[PDB]
Design a protein around this nucleic acid. Structure first.
Lengths: 155, 66, 86, 186, 223, 180, 125
RNA sequence: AUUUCACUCAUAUUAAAUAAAAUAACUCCAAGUGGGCCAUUUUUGGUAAGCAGAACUGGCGAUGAGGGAUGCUCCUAACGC
RNA sequence: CCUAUUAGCUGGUUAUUUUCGAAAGAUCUCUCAGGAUCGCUGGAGUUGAUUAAUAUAAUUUUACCAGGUAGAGAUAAUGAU
RNA sequence: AUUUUAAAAUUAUUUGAAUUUUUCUUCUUAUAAUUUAAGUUGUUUCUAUACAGUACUUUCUUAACCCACUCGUCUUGAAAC
């Protein structure tokens, strides 16, 4: 019977402890470019450009940039399919993503490692190791250092 | 008589029957209302290359066809 | 091609050798050890057992270290229980 | 009891066999099925697939469009699985050799006195079995009025579908929902 | 034409001697590997400096429940593990990702260390291979090495010799071995299950879970 | 050998440690020895007890060797001691335990049937800890003292149990119950 | 059960009868698929009038041949016999029911001298 | 920002794993449906209900087979001869 | 006689085999025994794949996000006590 | 009727080589066979030395062991009092 814009946002849009007050000074000092992954996190201190009910905490590409606003392309699941949605929010409600920094350093690693590897003509793979079984190695456990423990009864 | 007010039963099963479809991911999106006065400048950029390419091709065609 | 009977690749000697070119060599080589007479093993069993005195001594040392560790753990458990009983 | 999609049976979509009982067309599809099976030619495979297509997917190709498509190689042979129609908007046509299902009489005459000739698909198979120097084309398949009504329904936002109306006057399907003055627009 | 028959005849002997020398090489490799493993364990026995193998990088998984009343993600895990029938069995390379994805399906399977004799038995008497073309695989029993060579000869792992040589010690080609191998369709156990409803690890009799090294007896009883 | 009488317990000893971390560059090593139905079952029980007493599991524990350090002589006759802890339908209770058999393998397992028969305590409720060796005179139990007496006897008035061979249904006449 | 005579194997005899055709007596025994809802025969309850299916289909190698091990062919007069001159050991002839006595005689003699076998050779005599 | 020229980032196991992943994707025409119910877990009203109302998943409906003596929904397991 | 009036309602609705195969949600409605429209389904067709890959995935891993339910508390705030 | 062929194995050779050290040790230079290859063939009786029976094929009628509730329909649910 109640489906307002801010319905059910008592805690989601509530400001955190010690975090009350306007956004920090240099929050306005992020270089946003087109086609950039970015998280959309609501800031209730700023009311204009507030992200809508469902998109808090989501992530999406930047498809629009205006003087103080950003258009974000966020895929939302409805019924039987996911469809794209363009949400236009002010920049205080936008936080630069931390999905591409995982590969920024990898792609800098490529230009310094694969180059030297090919020019010296070795075969080296770069895929992630997804390490499972630990290898076999020769160990030295000390007979003095080895200590014993045991379980305990009821009390 | 009383009617079933609401239920979400069988709904996501029906969804996964044909699967949760995804956007088609087109390479180019229209920018009809996207940041005017900038893509107008891009429009002006494109004609600069177009005019020189067209005149060069026409001159080459005429000089080769005599 | 037409399907034939799937010959047992483990008991059918011809098809098993066709699958494994080394199988016939391995089987004959093991059959030779089997054919080795009882006199050789009877004479060499004592030598093989006495050549492993060092190995069994090392195993005994490790097991007795385990036994001493268990005994000392028992001692510490009893000391703690006795200390906290009062 | 097995867990497979549609009980593990691979399903294919589209035409399996031609449904036209035209004896010459049946001979043609048999010949090109043999050619596609024996030769490794994707050219022959594509022709064999296209020969059994429905009429709406063998659209006519205009003479002007044929000439434009074959402009960049004049010594090659055009080949289309549809009909060839004359384009009165084209002033002059020159030296074009094309194989097609059907030629309209005027287009055939024009191609003939322009210095080219019209080949049928049996001739094309006879003298280019592997499709060397042959470029295959097709007309605009979804340019007909039928798909002008397809896509998003007319009434959805930004929908270009053509509605089913009796007449295109102001009194027919123009007032409410098609202009901002009456309720909404589109 | 006339030269063709002798051209195709000579390549038979060429590949025959090539693969014979390679079988000599792998025989040397089995002997070396057995000697190395035994000596590395004896070194551990020598002093208080231990040695072991970690998780053997390969596990054998057998489904235990039917195709009815299953959670959707359990069904998806079964589908992409290729465990689709009640008595299906597969080889699974062991790593963090697949171990995590198999833990969610643990109560419906039993899995453990296959060991060499059991993998050889499974491949020789229950091994079926996808000889058909991509997505048209047409399950076929091995019965030969021609299909194995056709699918893997250019990748020099041609032969059931090589397939066992590769499946036990998980070398560089597990993709082209596990995926090439059809899912094993095992018989019901000769002596029977204990309790499919309960874990193998509970004090009461039970079946599902990680049998570790105890699955060899179950496999050769089910084979 | 008779399989029906025998249980299915053998010896094992597997050694490892918690994972050395950046925070814990040099962790200490620990060990403990129990027997159960299987080596895997014993490993699971050991990891459960590790999680209950300390904070570690497979996610933070590894093993670095495995051996089967069997007994000195399985044919010996012993008297050992363990500590029992179990729970009922309303609480928990603890005591000690000692019994005689040939080896620790069945020495662990003769207790479960008695516990289930008397207190209906399923095996998932009993905990056994700290196996060691007991004395023969220090036992304050009633029954176990006469076990190692100097000389003892009693009759054999148990009912006969014949083979399926000779458990013939129709008898010529009624059998007696004396035997010998 | 199955009948195994020679190479010919018939997977089922005693052709299916319509449900309730025994007790209900306007209902002819000729098989009809019962739609119903709680019909118990569509539901396939145990021990009641199992329905014909595709699993009962005979081997196509020995499908339409008689215990004669030959395919039957019905003939109206002597002008329909020629095609059997290449298949006298694969086909057995059978006179049509509405063929007169002397026509039957003159085609039976032709079949005899043609060495092809006739099924209903002892009809109307 | 766009375009064009250079160089080049494993591409000969595949920029982590696994995958009867193209049985995919899209379009057109159209049927039936739009009274639901039950089970585990969670939960609202009610003293409670084989009560009324919701969430997830699976079933009954639409489905038989072996078992629970018996049973639309429980366990095993889904079905050509 | 108009008239075989109308009926969102009840009953009935006729040969076989094979293949695919649901919904009892949702929005609007003088709507709540109905209808339309989405969703689920079938048929038809094209583009694709057919190159143990890529698209793809009710799966996991790695990296990074958002939460305020369970729990915990009255000395941390309100409301109690 | 232009792969039940090639190889694989075995036998009888033979060539040289080899090594576990040889009466089932291993591999080609060459031959001839055979099947363990390359999904069952052989021997003897009977039918039987007949034109249709006491046998053989089949239909029907009876029993017997196990099973089996009136169908159609509305319905979440019908064998339904």
């Amino acid at each position: 019977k109640s489906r307002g814009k801010r319905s059910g946002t008592r805690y989601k849009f509530s400001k955190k402890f010690r975090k009350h007050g306007e956004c920090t000074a240099n929050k306005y000092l992020e270089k946003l470019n087109y086609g950039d992954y970015v998280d959309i996190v609501c800031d209730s201190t700023q009311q204009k450009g507030m992200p809508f009910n469902y998109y808090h905490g989501k992530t999406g590409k930047i498809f629009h940039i205006t003087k103080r606003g950003v258009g974000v392309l966020v895929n939302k699941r409805v019924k039987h399919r996911i469809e794209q949605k363009k949400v236009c929010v002010r920049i205080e409600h936008v936080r630069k993503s931390r999905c591409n920094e995982d590969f920024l350093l990898r792609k800098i690693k490529n230009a310094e490692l694969i180059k030297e590897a090919k020019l010296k003509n070795e075969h080296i793979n770069i895929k992630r190791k997804t390490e499972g079984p630990k290898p076999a190695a020769m160990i030295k456990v000390p007979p003095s250092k080895i200590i014993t423990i045991e379980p305990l009864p009821f009390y | 008589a009383k009617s079933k007010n609401h239920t979400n039963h069988n709904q996501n099963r029906k969804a996964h029957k044909n699967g949760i479809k995804k956007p088609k991911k087109h390479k180019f999106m229209s920018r009809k209302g996207l940041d005017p006065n900038f893509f107008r400048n891009q429009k002006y950029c494109l004609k600069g290359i177009q005019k020189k390419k067209k005149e060069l091709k026409l001159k080459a065609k005429q000089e080769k066809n005599n | 091609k037409k399907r034939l009977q799937n010959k047992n690749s483990l008991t059918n000697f011809a098809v098993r050798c066709r699958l494994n070119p080394a199988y016939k060599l391995l089987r004959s080589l093991a059959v030779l050890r089997m054919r080795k007479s009882i006199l050789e093993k009877s004479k060499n069993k004592k030598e093989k057992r006495v050549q492993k005195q060092i190995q069994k001594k090392e195993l005994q040392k490790i097991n007795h270290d385990y036994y001493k560790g268990v005994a000392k753990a028992v001692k510490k458990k009893k000391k703690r229980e006795e200390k906290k009983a009062k | 009891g097995i867990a497979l999609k549609n009980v593990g049976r691979i399903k294919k979509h589209g035409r399996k066999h031609l449904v036209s009982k035209n004896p010459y067309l049946r001979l043609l599809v048999k010949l090109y099925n043999f050619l596609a099976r024996r030769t490794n030619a994707n050219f022959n495979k594509i022709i064999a697939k296209r020969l059994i297509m429905p009429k709406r997917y063998r659209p006519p190709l205009s003479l002007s469009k044929l000439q434009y498509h074959m402009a960049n190689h004049p010594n090659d042979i055009a080949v289309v699985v549809g009909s060839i129609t004359d384009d009165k908007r084209l002033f002059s046509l020159k030296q074009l050799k094309v194989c097609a299902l059907r030629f309209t009489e005027t287009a055939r005459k024009r191609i003939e006195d322009a210095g080219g000739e019209c080949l049928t698909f049996d001739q094309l198979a006879l003298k280019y079995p592997t499709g060397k120097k042959c470029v295959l084309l097709r007309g605009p398949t979804k340019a007909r009025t039928a798909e002008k009504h397809f896509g998003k329904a007319p009434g959805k936002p930004k929908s270009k579908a053509r509605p089913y109306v009796r007449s295109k006057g102001r009194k027919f399907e123009k007032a409410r929902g098609r202009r901002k003055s009456r309720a909404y627009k589109k | 034409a006339a030269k063709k028959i002798k051209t195709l005849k000579l390549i038979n002997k060429k590949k025959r001697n090539d693969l014979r020398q390679r079988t000599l090489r792998y025989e040397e490799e089995y002997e070396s590997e057995r000697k190395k493993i035994i000596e590395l364990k004896r070194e551990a026995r020598k002093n208080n400096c231990f040695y072991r193998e970690a998780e053997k990088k390969v596990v054998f998984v057998i489904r235990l429940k039917g195709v009815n009343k299953l959670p959707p993600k359990v069904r998806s895990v079964f589908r992409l593990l290729r465990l689709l029938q009640v008595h299906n069995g597969v080889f699974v390379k062991v790593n963090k990702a697949t171990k995590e994805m198999l833990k969610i399906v643990e109560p419906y399977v039993t899995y453990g260390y296959p060991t060499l004799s059991t993998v050889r038995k499974l491949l020789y008497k229950r091994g079926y291979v996808r000889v058909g073309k991509v997505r048209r695989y047409a399950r076929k029993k091995i019965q030969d090495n021609a299909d194995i060579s056709k699918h893997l000869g250019k990748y020099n792992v041609h032969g059931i010799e090589d397939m066992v040589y590769q499946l036990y010690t998980c070398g560089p080609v597990f993709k082209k071995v596990n995926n090439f191998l059809w899912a094993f369709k095992l018989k019901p156990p000769r002596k029977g299950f204990k309790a499919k409803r309960h874990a193998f690890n509970e004090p009461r009799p039970g079946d599902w879970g990680n049998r570790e090294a105890h699955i060899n007896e179950l496999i050769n009883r089910m084979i | 050998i008779d399989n029906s009488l025998n249980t299915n317990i053998h010896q094992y000893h597997i050694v490892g440690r918690a994972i050395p971390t950046a925070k814990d560059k040099n962790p200490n090593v620990y060990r403990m020895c129990i027997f159960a139905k299987n080596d895997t079952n014993a490993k699971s029980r050991f990891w459960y007890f590790m999680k209950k007493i300390n904070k570690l599991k497979k996610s933070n524990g590894e093993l670095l060797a495995c051996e089967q350090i069997k007994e000195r002589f399985p044919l010996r006759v012993k008297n050992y001691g363990v500590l029992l802890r179990y729970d009922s339908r309303t609480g928990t209770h603890n005591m000690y335990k000692e019994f005689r058999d040939t080896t620790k393998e069945g020495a662990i397992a003769q207790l479960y049937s008695e516990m289930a028969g008397r207190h209906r305590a399923r095996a998932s409720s009993i905990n056994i800890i700290r196996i060691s060796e007991i004395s023969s005179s220090l036992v304050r139990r009633p029954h176990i003292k006469q076990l190692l007496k100097r000389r003892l006897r009693f009759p054999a008035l148990h009912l006969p149990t014949l083979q399926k061979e000779y458990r013939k249904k129709f008898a010529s006449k009624r059998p007696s119950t004396y035997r010998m | 059960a199955v009948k195994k005579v020679g190479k010919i194997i018939k997977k089922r005899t005693k052709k299916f009868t319509r449900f309730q055709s025994n007790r209900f007596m306007r209902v002819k025994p000729a098989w009809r698929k019962p739609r119903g809802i709680d019909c118990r025969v569509r539901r396939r309850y145990k021990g009641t009038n199992l329905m014909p299916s595709i699993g009962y289909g005979s081997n196509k190698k020995t499908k339409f041949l008689l215990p004669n091990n030959k395919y039957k062919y019905v003939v109206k007069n002597v002008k329909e016999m020629e095609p059997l001159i290449m298949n006298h050991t694969k086909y057995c002839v059978q006179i049509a029911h509405n063929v007169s006595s002397k026509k039957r005689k003159q085609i039976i003699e032709r079949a005899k001298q043609m060495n092809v076998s006739v099924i209903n050779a002892k009809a109307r005599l």
